[PDB]
Design a protein around this ligand. Structure first.
Ligand SMILES: Nc1ncnc2c1ncn2[C@@H]1O[C@H](COP(=O)(O)OP(=O)(O)O)[C@@H](O)[C@H]1O
Ligand SMILES: Nc1ncnc2c1ncn2[C@@H]1O[C@H](COP(=O)(O)OP(=O)(O)O)[C@@H](O)[C@H]1O
Ligand code: NA
Ligand code: NA
Ligand code: NA
Ligand code: NA
Lengths: 494, 494, 494, 494
């Protein structure tokens, strides 16, 4: 079951979080955060800029000083702290799920059973890594003892997007805190609220002051301030390929801070003629329409073998036509609103371009409600690789179906992209699955499934979909600085 | 192509190898080694017993002393020595393959292209591990620096069988020497010669005296002296399950030396009705008949789905009938003799049991030549799980074909065995492959192949097929002793 | 602060635990467990034997069947369950610490602050391993995809001693349950009660029935029935070297089950002349007298460099004379009774032995109280290597002080033992530390400290102190069975 | 023993190496490479620019195509090819060592015994890694089989400096080729010759055409063309911190290619009062003067405790005065010329700033010969933290000796730098070694030694000394792209 939501949850946190305290922006400015189901302002949030980020970095640097409580703390105790935080998130699960829906738009049942579940699982996974990420002892030549310490990278800037506000926070904080780093986090202007409440929980869980600092605000102000900061050791950025470029340039123009990026995708979902038809249809629908189409790794290029194309397309249309768009607090709602007006307008722009460039509009294609940012589930057929809707990330409920003949052809077409975040293969055949999974140029390849995330398995892009990995053991590599200690000994023996 | 063999290679090495020198046994007794193709004596070999083993162990212990050339040698240099040994074995490849064939009976072409190749690949793989098996630095609670050293286990007793004389030597020496151990090796009385010649090469490569010592002799004498020795730190045994028991009791009854065992099997090879028929028949032939049927992981229970049974059986009988038995130096020969008279008679015993118990004799079933230990390729059909030939390891050219209906049926019947060394699955279906590889209780599961060994991938038994793993990184564990060092420090920081 | 103890805690659990239920022995037999502070019977406990062990093994086998709740359970959820068990143990901490003291004799302040603390830390550490012990994907030669699965070893027999009842239970359950095994545990007849209570918490935590089964009873009966069982896949034993031999023999003579052993020690604690004297005296006292001397890694050979010998002895003797023996429920008490009458007598025998062979009695040497099993802290000076009290594990409050001159000498003397569990070095010198830590043949070497255990750092013996390691990542190896799956693929590419 | 050098070694390779063939630049332009001992031109070398870079990248890309010989080659065979290359460099060691000296300036004895030895060790180290860098099998939640593939990152741009021409090439090629990548290398204009000859050996070794491509030319042209190239997946740059910035900006401005950097340093060498005086003085001299002072991790800030300061400086001055500068082909020469006239002039410039700002010139200070770029071993005493010679990397034979009082003081001073490449500590004290190696913010900390490089131990910068690590297992991380494959399975079991 799912507990009944409070459909108008009280907001408690709306300021800058530095040193476990709440601060107005130095400018005293605030910006509104909007409910995308109604288009109405939820509340004002402090508008952090460069000066606020400066305060935050100083607090973070102080917390990181040798001999500080956070630096001296046992690695196992960092685990306990992460597990305490997860316990508190779970305590406030019903509230956070409802707030998540209020600010973002996603169905409450999904906030509750999916987003909040994944958040708990991620934080508890990483709690487990805290005292387990060993350095090495190394059999170097000569009369020496040589070993590596895995140290924290230090002051980590973390700039996150609005599509999974709580989950992306957890994906960042989990590996960073498990490895003893300190954080300055810039949350998305569209969805700052849940992350700020979680900051209260960080304080309650007992993290020392300055270990996690949150600065809500805009990208070119607060975000750029972090990426170009002289005393941020590392930046992790999740967002558009376009702003990823800005981040890497900022890093290089400033202090040569370490950089990881999780960017867009145009992920191919490949349906072989021997696929389980009903399963493949349902999963392709999910792969595209999940979270209002607002997923980095959305199955936005649906390649279907010619022999099953017609039936696949028929079945896909029926499912898109029966997908329930409405109030995200109604249990029956499958699809909420898009996150804001800019997104709403951009997706509608893409549907227009799709119609214009000769893609066959099979269903939807319009606005779904007269208030809030609701869009009809849209399916385009006979899509061609050169079409704008086949190339550009739409980030909306707009499905592309493309026809192919051969396994060799579809590999070339799938790989023909500057993106490489994810892909999938639907087939009953062992050799087809292995052929395709090895040939596909993508960070994750799903076989007879889609959007299967696990805290244990790494995720991240090939090509311009980003670099570095999040989740799994791999997710600790960007948060570790490696020191070699080589010691002269009287006589080295095996 | 394969170089022409010397069909009567000269024997240079036939004594006990200790401190890089050749010794008569202390009793001065010798035993004959026989050419299995003719039944004739090749030469006499020193008959090592307890006294000779005692000498060998003292030499190994001295070589292992803290501050010795072997203990002080750079880990990378152990790699250099292993690679040098591989180069010398390559230099003498034509000679060694022909000697292997003389003493063991396997086809010279197989000795050359298979055994010798796998030996080189194994030594060269482990050469690469020598300086790469790191200890750990560990984030323990409190003000401490904690780390582990991976030290050699020490003096390693290695008792090996006759079925792959050179490969079994390499499988044992590669990981032992990569990790800085010293060795007292007991070779099989049936096949002592190639391993003794390799000892000459170990000396030539530059290994310090005492690092590898070799005692040819019998099992209850030299073998048991090693297993029961008060100064041997570790024993690795490969052989029968019966002697495995003897070895583990000897270790328990002596100094609690560490034990690993590679023992027999009765490995199931499962052919689903969707398998590629031509491929499955050829691979099932190989799986069973490879090396005169003298393979620990022989596919000696061939389970075939009922819809393909008659055709599979027909094809299998034709393949067995075409199999050329003859002089192992003749390039046309596919099957040499069995290793000795004891094995010869045991295998004929098993065939007579097969017939008497109601299995269907479809081809072979008798002696194949009037000289040497040759047995016709023998196929039994309509084999039942309760039959002797379905349960006991035959270790000869005797194939069992069993009929089944369902996947759940075959899983349980395959698993209903006290052995679990290997298994194989032939199918085109992804889900059947995955279901079976998970469900099968065996150390290696091959999918659409058989007898695929890589130096990179571990190999070893479940259940009574033994314990521990050889090959890959895993092959190093049994040869490492772990030391934790925990050091008080002024102030631990992350 | 330590919560006031219930000095007469109620006993709730005194039966055989199988399938989450409490059972009498088939025989209906019960055995008294005694309070060592008073020599009085606490209560009677069900006396399990072969037939009860047979039921417990059948239940574990059932819980391990493919498709069972325990086998299908997400690894992450095994972590949640271990975490929940740690929470319940912490909830009942005050009760469990008092019950431990009642049955074992150790001071309540130590049960509470040390034993219980270490139990919680072990379980929480292994909770974190549950979903992180990865197998490997392997770049084998040829057109294959090769990988390994790390599967559970299966039905694990675990036989534990009486010196750290709750801790030894946790050391065994932690890694077995994290890796998905099932357990039949035989607890010590001297100290059954606390482990049985924890069984109640295993049920309360939500572990499926048959995952943990506990059989109280005696060694030659219940313990030997586990070791010889034909369906137990792995046995883990902690206790005497003497019984260790029996276990390895029983394993070899039965089904060749996998064995690990945690046995005795006679661990050298080396004090160099440049050591911090006050520290080294206090730590040498703790190293020996901790837990009534009943510790496998007790520093039972204290080697002191000659220039500081006289002062070190003077100070050690004053320290032993000041050690408070009495009621373990009194907060003033440093030392409680020995565990039982047998150990009491064995220690008195060793004390008389030291006097007979000429070691200098500096203090203690007698019975400390009328009731229970209390022995005076005893220090022997001028101990020589050849003496029985210098060679054999005493397991009581009996300290040996040996004098040495050189670092090279002391290495040789420290290593001249068939034991090799632990060692320590006290020195301010970098090179002396590194020289000694390298040269000492011991599973753990402490430097300027003693008895510093971390859940993160492995622990186990060299030589006749045992084999295999407990704690850390290494603790998982003995609980994992490795399966290679090697799959033919159309065309292997890097 | 060292073979007599050819002091005018012949030049065979001076063109652009693409597809295992030699090419003139598209422009037909050449640049002189100069002998720094004489100031005379050795020969002309093809001047590569963007058009030649483009030809090379297309070559690398083709060689990387799925199904090409290099992609399909067994990982173990990649290892064999690396070992073959090492064998060829060893065969040609005398020639290559003389060529290195001729083009670079370093003493022939050093080229031969140090650089060449290190090149061989690096390549043979990485040969061993080729088939051992496993991906993982991951116990993800749900009915899934999840695993990682460690794939090559792809086309690798490698831009290397002039100070260790052959070694830097090896450091780059070793890990890149072990993991199946393809390379476009830009060698330093000052030292192109040796790396070009090694390209001949790469062809001879049997590496498929296009796997390694080498473009000599200038930085703003050929190097920038590599960094900005839209089909280069990864760039690795070694050189100045200034140009490191340019690289990172170029990567984010183009295709968001993966970046690792090895930049400058101003490494502190800390001499505690309890240090071994003779050894510390010799090591501090080596630490600064190695390779004409042309070492990224040079001990260019020598901190000396005040109690030993006077003696230490006195001895350091005597040692620098006795250092032999001259013809690098003469066996008596310890120091050759600096690499070129720019470096020559820059160093004299720093010597002038040292005099101007009031540092105590103790010896040297000027040119050491009328021909070639020879500079006197120069020592400054009483150096202060604010001085230019204490802050900026000089990259010449100019030693800075600074005085300190306390361990706490020197930590702060050592860490007060935007560099963090290496540091060293000289002390006999265990606690001081541990305290310092932990507190020092440097990629490598040497204790009682300096410039101890091992192929096994990673090396790289903290802060603006760069990012990522080379050597050891860590050196493979930047050359790997991680793919997750997650497969729906019928029913997941442990
Ligand atoms: N110039 C910038 N520098 C740093 N961060 C930015 C910049 N612009 C936007 N951001 C931030 O990056 C995150 C990802 O959003 P963004 O890439 O702008 O996606 P979109 O523009 O499609 O909404 C957000 O938190 C946003 O505030
Ligand atoms: N023959 C045996 N087989 C199996 N377990 C035994 C045997 N004898 C004793 N045990 C058990 O092993 C554990 C350790 O005991 P042991 O090594 O005998 O120490 P002690 O005799 O000094 O108490 C206890 O649980 C004990 O009951
Ligand atoms: Na919003
Ligand atoms: Na023979
Ligand atoms: Na008791
Ligand atoms: Na030059």
């Amino acid at each position: 079951a799912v507990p009944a939501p409070n459909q108008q949850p009280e907001v408690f946190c709306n300021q800058i979080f530095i040193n476990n305290e709440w601060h107005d922006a130095v400018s005293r400015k605030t910006f509104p955060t909007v409910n995308p189901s109604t288009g109405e302002v939820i509340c004002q949030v402090a508008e952090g800029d460069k000066e606020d980020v400066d305060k935050a970095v100083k607090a973070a640097r102080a917390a990181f000083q040798l001999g500080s409580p956070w630096r001296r703390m046992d690695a196992s105790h960092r685990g306990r702290l992460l597990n305490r935080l997860a316990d508190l998130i779970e305590r406030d699960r019903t509230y956070l799920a409802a707030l998540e829906t209020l600010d973002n738009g996603k169905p409450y049942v999904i906030s509750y059973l999916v987003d909040l579940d994944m958040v708990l699982k991620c934080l508890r996974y990483y709690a487990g890594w805290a005292d387990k990420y060993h350095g090495k002892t190394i059999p170097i030549d000569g009369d020496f003892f040589s070993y590596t310490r895995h140290e924290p990278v230090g002051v980590c800037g973390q700039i996150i997007p609005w599509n999974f506000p709580l989950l992306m926070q957890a994906w960042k904080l989990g590996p960073a805190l498990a490895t003893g780093n300190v954080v300055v986090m810039k949350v998305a202007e569209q969805t700052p609220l849940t992350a700020l409440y979680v900051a209260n929980l960080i304080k309650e869980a007992g993290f020392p002051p300055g270990v996690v600092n949150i600065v809500p605000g805009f990208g070119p102000t607060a975000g750029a301030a972090i990426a170009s900061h002289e005393d941020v050791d590392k930046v992790a950025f999740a967002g558009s390929t376009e702003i990823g470029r800005v981040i890497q340039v900022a890093a290089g123009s400033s202090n040569l801070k370490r950089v990881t990026l999780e960017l867009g995708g145009k992920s191919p979902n490949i349906i072989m003629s021997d696929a389980d038809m009903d399963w493949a249809v349902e999963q392709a629908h999910f792969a595209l329409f999940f979270n209002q189409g607002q997923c980095c790794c959305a199955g936005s290029r649906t390649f279907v073998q010619e022999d099953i194309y017609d039936e696949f397309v028929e079945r896909s249309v029926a499912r898109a036509k029966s997908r329930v768009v409405g109030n995200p607090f109604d249990s029956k709602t499958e699809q909420g609103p898009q996150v804001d007006e800019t997104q709403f307008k951009k997706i509608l722009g893409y549907i227009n371009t799709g119609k214009q460039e000769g893609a066959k509009l099979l269903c939807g294609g319009g606005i779904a409600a007269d208030r809030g940012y609701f869009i009809q589930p849209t399916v385009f057929g006979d899509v061609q690789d050169g079409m704008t809707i086949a190339k550009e990330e739409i980030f909306g409920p707009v499905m592309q179906i493309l026809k192919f003949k051969t396994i060799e052809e579809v590999v070339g077409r799938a790989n023909n992209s500057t993106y490489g975040l994810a892909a999938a293969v639907f087939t009953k055949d062992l050799d087809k699955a292995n052929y395709l999974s090895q040939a596909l140029q993508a960070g994750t390849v799903w076989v007879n499934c889609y959007d299967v995330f696990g805290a244990q398995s790494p995720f991240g892009g090939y090509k311009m979909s980003g670099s570095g990995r999040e989740l799994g053991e791999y997710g600790l590599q960007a948060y570790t600085e490696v020191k070699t200690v080589t010691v002269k000994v009287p006589q080295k023996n095996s």
